[PDB]
Design an enzyme around this catalytic site. Sequence first.
Site, PDB file in Angstrom:
ATOM      1  N   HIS B  41     -44.321   1.968   3.271  1.00 26.79           N
ATOM      2  CA  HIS B  41     -43.369   2.515   4.228  1.00 26.79           C
ATOM      3  C   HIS B  41     -43.623   2.167   5.681  1.00 26.79           C
ATOM      4  O   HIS B  41     -42.727   2.383   6.490  1.00 26.79           O
ATOM      5  CB  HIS B  41     -43.123   4.016   4.027  1.00 26.79           C
ATOM      6  CG  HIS B  41     -44.349   4.822   3.768  1.00 26.79           C
ATOM      7  ND1 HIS B  41     -44.930   4.924   2.515  1.00 26.79           N
ATOM      8  CD2 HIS B  41     -45.090   5.603   4.592  1.00 26.79           C
ATOM      9  CE1 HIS B  41     -45.953   5.756   2.574  1.00 26.79           C
ATOM     10  NE2 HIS B  41     -46.077   6.178   3.822  1.00 26.79           N
ATOM     11  N   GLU B  72     -46.464   0.784  -3.900  1.00 25.19           N
ATOM     12  CA  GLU B  72     -46.374   1.487  -2.587  1.00 25.19           C
ATOM     13  C   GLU B  72     -47.406   1.048  -1.535  1.00 25.19           C
ATOM     14  O   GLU B  72     -47.723   1.806  -0.600  1.00 25.19           O
ATOM     15  CB  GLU B  72     -46.399   3.005  -2.783  1.00 25.19           C
ATOM     16  CG  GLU B  72     -45.952   3.872  -1.591  1.00 25.19           C
ATOM     17  CD  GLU B  72     -44.450   3.738  -1.232  1.00 25.19           C
ATOM     18  OE1 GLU B  72     -43.681   3.065  -1.995  1.00 25.19           O
ATOM     19  OE2 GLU B  72     -44.074   4.304  -0.152  1.00 25.19           O
ATOM     20  N   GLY B 146     -47.186  11.324   8.888  1.00 23.08           N
ATOM     21  CA  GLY B 146     -48.137  10.718   9.865  1.00 23.08           C
ATOM     22  C   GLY B 146     -49.553  10.647   9.297  1.00 23.08           C
ATOM     23  O   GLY B 146     -50.493  10.076   9.895  1.00 23.08           O
ATOM     24  N   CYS B 148     -49.598   9.213   6.399  1.00 25.60           N
ATOM     25  CA  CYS B 148     -49.414   7.928   5.715  1.00 25.60           C
ATOM     26  C   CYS B 148     -50.383   6.897   6.238  1.00 25.60           C
ATOM     27  O   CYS B 148     -50.579   6.741   7.439  1.00 25.60           O
ATOM     28  CB  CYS B 148     -47.976   7.428   5.849  1.00 25.60           C
ATOM     29  SG  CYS B 148     -46.803   8.613   5.213  1.00 25.60           S
TER      30      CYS B 148
END
Lengths: 181, 181
Positions: B41, B72, B146, B148
């Site tokens: 992402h 991912e 955040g 992440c």
Amino acid sequence: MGPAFEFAVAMMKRNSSTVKTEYGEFTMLGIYDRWAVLPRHAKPGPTILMNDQEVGVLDAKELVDKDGANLELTLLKLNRNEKFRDIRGFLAKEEVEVNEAVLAINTSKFPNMYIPVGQVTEYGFLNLGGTPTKRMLMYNFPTRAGQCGGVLMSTGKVLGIHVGGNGHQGFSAALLKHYFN
Amino acid sequence: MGPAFEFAVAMMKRNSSTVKTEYGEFTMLGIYDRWAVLPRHAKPGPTILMNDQEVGVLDAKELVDKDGANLELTLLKLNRNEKFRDIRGFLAKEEVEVNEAVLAINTSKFPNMYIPVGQVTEYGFLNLGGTPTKRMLMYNFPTRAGQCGGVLMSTGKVLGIHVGGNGHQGFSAALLKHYFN
């Protein structure tokens, strides 16, 4: 560092809670009985929110030294039945300096977070945004807001409560044993 | 817990950096050479900001399994001279399960923060907001955005990269040794 984190995690789990006042969300440390501490800037009202439940505040002492100087801590007495684990024997008689400290924060914005701040030195006197403040402890860490209330710890010692910062330095009020009577 | 935090702090100091893409700010782990990893992402562009300095991105691989399923993670190769400390020997051949993990975050919103997540279990398959995702690791911790990019670690092991959450559960993509060639 490891033993300090281990100490901090167990301490926070046993004696800390997340508190909401009209001025924000803060980490709060229960000290003994129904007495806890908050950074002064939490300005608690006659009721607070403690782990999302409403609690009455029987008393609030904005702590100052003998010559009236700001200490930047507010002690509060809560209207509730459950008693805090007595942690007064972790509180030093005077300002602790250490080479490895951990700062623990427990709010919505920072849930169970721990920060290695390393060396803590009694900085002492500080003009904390206009206010002459004493009994400050200083450590170097890139401050953000919402860390207020964070608990400063080392192995076996609760040293202070985080009350301010400037981008690379943080300040805690020293949490002295004698505040507690 | 203590040795995991000690491991994490040294790991982050040696191999981690804060990265800004057009999609946000992320923790980034360098793996070896000029190769690093980001959660998918982060969608890095042809340049990123790494500790506030601009860096060219020579390559970006959105990792999928043999049957095409989302993993991912995005591997990226950076255009810079300095080489990452080789940490490939910390990466497991397969999904690690552990009873005590620490999640480390290094951004502006969460600067040098560490979170005890306890037990990590290979959760495996997960529908991560519409997308079928595999090789997920799960731990229980009150997620915020955040985080992440956060790096999931235990003593001597880099286990994965934090990629998602739902209020009480967090998910990391498993960081496998074989991704790295």
